Design a protein around this ligand. Structure first.
Ligand SMILES: OC[C@H]1O[C@@H](O[C@@H]2[C@@H](O)[C@@H](O)O[C@H](CO)[C@@H]2O)[C@H](O)[C@@H](O)[C@H]1O
Ligand SMILES: OC[C@H]1O[C@@H](O[C@@H]2[C@@H](O)[C@@H](O)O[C@H](CO)[C@@H]2O)[C@H](O)[C@@H](O)[C@H]1O
Ligand SMILES: OC[C@H]1O[C@@H](O[C@@H]2[C@@H](O)[C@@H](O)O[C@H](CO)[C@@H]2O)[C@H](O)[C@@H](O)[C@H]1O
Ligand SMILES: OC[C@H]1O[C@@H](O[C@@H]2[C@@H](O)[C@@H](O)O[C@H](CO)[C@@H]2O)[C@H](O)[C@@H](O)[C@H]1O
Ligand SMILES: [Ca+2]
Ligand SMILES: [Ca+2]
Ligand SMILES: [Ca+2]
Ligand SMILES: [Ca+2]
Ligand SMILES: [Mn+2]
Ligand SMILES: [Mn+2]
Ligand SMILES: [Mn+2]
Ligand SMILES: [Mn+2]
Lengths: 232, 232, 232, 232
């Protein structure tokens, strides 16, 4: 079988295994900071440098994958804590949308909320133009920040959050488990056909953004990933 | 929210936090050995002593859970490497079936292969009486060892295996991700209505078994767990 | 620190994690066949798609690495069994030398035998023009196929060979263990200052070649690898 | 030439191939446990019964060798995690130092920290009496636990470590590659003249020890080895 697996305990600029897009920066503690606290409509994204083959046009098979990561969002003065973080999957040529206004687009869609991607978002502001739930939430996105499904969640300022995701190729289920700082877990699952919504080659990463009045610290602290694709 | 969580980097008989049933034993290295290599039709199980409330007859809500554990299986001359380990959920009064014949029942069912439980099996022998697949496999079981669904796997003697399990109550989906020695992951998912198959309070645990000629080492190395029930 | 690692039990055409150069090909059994038995001066190379930082100009630190792979060379009528395989390290922009005549250059050098790389060769033909020993041999090469050092070895047709390489940055020592067919091991060590011979970013890989009358099957069966660069 | 190779996926007492000394013991899982968690100043060692001829007084030739092994060290309440494991080579009549205080002596040296042996230590406690580095480390010892050289390492409790060692007789270099739970590899090499420090025949093995307020589980899980000496 064909397998891709890596494990970043910390990060560093200069590491060829990571592509940085937008206002991304690396703190001396090894943490990746996605947004610029002084830029309007700031957008920052990080991607696993190497493209990943999630399905084969020859066999018709689709890969399964186990991945885990931890992040943090902390408030600042005197901006509104926004907008959130999103773990996404997209075409290997994925780039920050042109004229991106950040905000609720999470740096992955256009102003209308559309884009070519699949991801799990950790939304901390309610953008009605995207039909967001009234409170903080985790959501499953398929080519849109207007989630196919969401679940109530709470973003604690300065809290270290852990996430684990499993994509069972056979059932096409994308399962997400979120462990908050206080110990409780929040989950959300949804059938998503990666073969129908994405190309054979893709890139995984994280993206975050803010607006003029909405800003906050967005940090990625760790990330492990393992995908396996059956060749016969 | 009603949350239950714990972590074991090692175990030890003497810690009431765990029930010890059957031939189970705890090795000086903190490993839980499930079966007795010298016994015939051996059966050993271990349970987290505190019963977990998976659903409320009050709210009608079902809990979600994220659990991870590592185990190890190793061959021993001159017996056929059987029968395997099963991670199960069952009534809080669960006990090894009366007059258990071990072997393919994995220590959780009667001879016909029936019992009261829900679990994930890591089967290493092909019992035809239970409709097992030709090779080693991971299966989702509901009240029977005649798995509801299975995926081809391979048990490597001496190899330390990791497993992550997610149960999303809303979609009633159980997701399993097994990390193999060669590096590949293997997944299997299945919709299982816990609230319809198990009582309000249950006990989580592990079980393993052998027969006259089928025997091997079954070890549980570690195990973390977290369940959250919405009480609103 | 910064680490790159992987493990290939088999290969496949299409995996974006690998760069194919020249007459390389992938067999139905997963093996990588480096040369084309019908071409004159055939040359095929395979490199890990992602660049590895073996040293940092900012800190001055040099990474260490551990790697193991297995290959097979099989005779074919009526050509002379040549020319062999070389595990090498080169700048990330590496390509098969323009106008390569294959043969004794092993696909990494020009006619005089010079080039920009570091590698371990498993030579099965004596090219007097490159001061080769009279018999088959394993050699440490630094910017030339005129080995810095060699040790007598023997290529057994159809035999699977296991190789282990360790690079200790502190002593700049490159150690090689080779597992013959008859069970014996052969070793060779040489001090090579990578920080002095190569750029910060390089690629790792294999290469094989042939001439008009010299041809043989060159197969790479497996490959694991891990290198770590201290970022402090 | 003259070769000696073996491989252990599991060991057992009552097996000729291996010698046991001190508090050694073999757990049901085939693992070797060196130090006894109960006794004070415990010391356990294991040796490959058949002595190996590393050099010839007739030719002057010295053998080369490649050996790999995995081990596990795990904490225990409420003792200190010490002292470590050491892979060593010594005269065929080697025995545990008379009136051994175990502990920082690793079971191979005397109180002053001296003995007849060459080895690679995996140290988890810093003994000032032997000039140890401030943190955990891997060291190359030559007739003394006051390492000829050391490298910063980190022993992770409950984790499995894979070790690779190459000895190139020609350059007299000993190279060590050690695994890390975080995916990082560590290396250390040192020129060691075996012929000068050891007799023609020796024994390879493992040794571990504990003190009064310092104990921990020391396990040897597997061990393969191959040495070849030219006899002409
Ligand atoms: O408060 C946070 C929230 O801001 C929205 O942006 C508005 C922007 O359109 C305009 O009206 O100016 C105000 C304050 O100057 C806000 O910046 C975003 O659309 C949301 O995504 C979120 O950042
Ligand atoms: O070989 C392994 C396998 O054994 C079956 O048990 C049989 C038992 O009925 C009787 O015939 O004796 C033989 C001895 O060779 C076996 O022990 C189990 O039914 C299987 O589950 C598995 O253990
Ligand atoms: O026999 C193998 C050997 O061949 C050399 O190449 C010669 C080539 O120069 C010319 O003389 O033609 C013959 C056969 O007709 C060979 O192809 C290579 O230089 C060696 O490296 C090796 O392949
Ligand atoms: O804590 C571990 C460490 O113990 C040292 O042993 C001392 C012993 O001599 C005496 O002073 O009592 C104390 C108790 O606090 C320790 O047991 C060893 O010298 C070290 O090698 C290591 O085992
Ligand atoms: Ca929003
Ligand atoms: Ca079975
Ligand atoms: Ca040659
Ligand atoms: Ca010490
Ligand atoms: Mn949203
Ligand atoms: Mn089964
Ligand atoms: Mn040569
Ligand atoms: Mn030391």
């Amino acid at each position: 079988a064909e397998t891709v697996s890596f494990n970043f305990n910390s990060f560093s600029e200069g590491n060829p295994a990571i592509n940085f897009q937008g206002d991304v920066t690396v703190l001396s503690n090894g943490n990746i900071q996605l947004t610029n606290l002084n830029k309007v409509n700031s957008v920052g994204r990080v991607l696993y440098a190497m493209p990943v083959r999630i399905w084969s046009s020859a066999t018709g098979n689709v890969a399964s994958f186990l991945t885990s990561f931890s992040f943090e969002m902390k408030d600042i003065k005197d901006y509104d804590p926004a907008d959130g973080i999103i773990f996404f999957i997209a075409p290997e040529d994925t780039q920050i949308p042109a004229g991106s206004i950040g905000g609720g687009t999470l740096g992955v869609s256009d102003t209308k909320g559309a884009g070519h991607f699949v991801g799990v978002e950790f939304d901390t502001y309610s953008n009605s133009e995207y039909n967001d739930p009234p409170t903080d939430h985790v959501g499953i996105d398929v080519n849109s920040v207007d989630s196919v499904k969401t679940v109530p969640w709470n973003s604690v300022s300065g809290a270290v959050v852990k996430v684990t995701v499993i994509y069972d190729s056979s059932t096409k289920t994308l399962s997400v488990a979120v462990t908050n700082d206080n110990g409780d877990i929040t989950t959300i699952a949804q059938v998503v056909d990666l073969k129908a919504k994405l190309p054979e080659r893709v890139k995984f990463g994280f993206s975050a953004s803010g607006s003029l009045g909405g800003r906050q610290i967005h940090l990625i602290r760790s990330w492990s990933f393992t995908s396996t694709l059956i060749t016969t």
